[PDB]
Here is the input.
Amino acid sequence: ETGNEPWDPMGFSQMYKVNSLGINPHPQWLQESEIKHGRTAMLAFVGTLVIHAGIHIPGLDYTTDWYNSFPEFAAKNPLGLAQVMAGLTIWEGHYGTEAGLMWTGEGTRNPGELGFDPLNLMKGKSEADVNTMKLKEIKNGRLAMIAMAGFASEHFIPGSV
Amino acid sequence: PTTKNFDPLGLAEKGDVLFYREAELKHCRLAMLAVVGMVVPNFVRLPGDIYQGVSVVEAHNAMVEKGPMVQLLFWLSLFEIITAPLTWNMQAKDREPGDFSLDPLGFCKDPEKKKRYQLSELKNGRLAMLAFSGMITQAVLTGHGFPYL
Amino acid sequence: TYWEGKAPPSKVLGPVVSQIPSPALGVISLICLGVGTYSVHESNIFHTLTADTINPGYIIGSLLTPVAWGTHVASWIQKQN
Amino acid sequence: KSASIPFMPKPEKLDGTVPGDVGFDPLGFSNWVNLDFLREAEIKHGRICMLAVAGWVAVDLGLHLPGDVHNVGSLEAHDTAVKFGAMSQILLWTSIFEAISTVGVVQMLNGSGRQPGYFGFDPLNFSKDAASKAKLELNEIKNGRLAMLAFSGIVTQAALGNDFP
Ligand code: CLA
Ligand SMILES: CC1=C(C#C/C(C)=C/C=C/C(C)=C/C=C/C=C(C)/C=C/C=C(C)/C=C/[C@@]23O[C@]2(C)C[C@@H](O)CC3(C)C)C(C)(C)C[C@H](O)C1
Here is the structure.
């Protein structure tokens, strides 16, 4: 907890005060981008941890070491790559309109709130339903981004542990 | 079971009830036909060399090689395409899930009888889906025939 | 046809497209994009194109990709209202 | 509310005044395009297919003159008629007629008021003599629809052998 207050050294949030005709992102866009990056980083941490030491999914070949995985993935299973790309494209397209409106303050959709509740959770009452767990998600996502950066840096220089 | 409201996930939120109920009805009807198409072919075989001793576990692939499956796919796909606006509109005023017409001449006018018949259809169709899942899985796992064991 | 706000009037799509409901345009655009990408990939990516490999069908499919973009834009315009 | 498909509501733009109306627009095509254009397309397809069915049957049974007689089955007629130039001539003349029909139909859809599938071609004046040409128009549309389906069949059947029925 960095003082339990907005931690913005270099003040990247405040530049929305200068209109700049919409050149500078509004805080909502940055918030949504941060949550996206955190979620991607945590799932990528799971992937790195397992694939680096893992039997790998039963399938054609699929012998990889987490750094050469994507070319092997594309070559061995073209249909799989095709459907992955198509599904991600569909998901991004369904949203994105709201993200486009989120560059300004016209998002109309709470940042990072997508229609994904496979298990209903209306228990929370404080602010946004269980706002505290939203903070938990963002925190572990920040840490996951740190972890992805750490593995990528350890790649070139054995930076640490 | 009886007077039991399950929906443990609670999917009504962020969803259209009429859409899901129409989906349920179509699934149910096709699964009932699936159960009887499982049962009958073994006892009774359509005339023709192609339709002889194909077996039910291996029916799909063999008939895909031959004409039949493509034909039935074409006709069912045509009917499904024809039925697009009914699903897309999701209008309450529009006919409730299931065809409003084509009902046999012997359909009770009483609203209570309509509810009873619709409930019977839904229950026997849910049994259909469960029954076919068991049937095909036990068909592939075990031997062949109506017992599937 | 000058328009302000966040969604253009349907008349921009022309006499025919402007009457098509959004889901129809969306499905048509998906089909067109799939066919066009598949055609462009089958020739010159998955298979090298030669003098005696010019399929008119693949050329039409490849031309169908800009149609897919136009139809997806039109579908969004119809969706906003 | 549709006579053909009662599940669907009565399609818009299909008032019933048009001959051959059975309220069949399950995909709502009529709403998409100007109706008179679609009607002209239907009538033209039907006329062409009536002519095509008659030609297929006649060629399969009887043949015109030498060169034309050698080709026999209509399957191997496009090629032969291309070779000795008949296709080029009929293409030229049909193209001239269609080109004039372009401006003819452009006048329509702009308020000219031409009836769909209307020309001055009534030398025997069957419809002109009869005040009730609705019977004739409905018959034309229905026999043309049957001809469309029948030609589609005949072609896709003879392309797979099946000799002659
Ligand atoms: C400039 C091209 C362009 C334009 C104007 C649009 C516009 C639109 N798209 Mg499409 N789209 C595009 C490219 C484009 N898209 C591409 C390349 C893909 C991937 C194949 C998609 C995939 C896609 C999906 C799957 C969906 C949309 C949807 C939409 C609509 C709402 C969402 C949206 O705009 O943000 C979405 C944001 C993006 C897709 C990011 C695109 C960013 C591009 C790549 C940047 C390139 C532009 C660049 C600045 C041009 C510089 C040129 C210069 C060098 C000469 C909107 C009408 C949605 C829709 O129609 O719903 C009804 C929808 O579901 N789009
Ligand atoms: C005229 C008229 C009317 C009418 C009418 C009528 C009678 C309509 C008739 C419709 C009709 C008769 C439609 C036939 C379809 C045949 C199909 C779809 C074939 C698919 C064929 C397929 C899928 C082929 C596959 C195969 O080839 C493959 C690949 C290899 C071979 O081993 C053979 C097989 C087959 C296996 C209305 C309706 C009353 C209204 C109107 O107002 C007036």
Notes: The radius of gyration of chain D is 19 Å. Chain D touches chain B at residues 5-9, 26-28 (CB under 8 Å). The pocket of chlorophyll A (ligand 1) is lined by residues A 89-90, 93-94, 96-97, 100; C 72-73, 75-76, 79 (CB under 6 Å). Residues 88 and 148 of chain D are 24 Å apart (CA to CA).
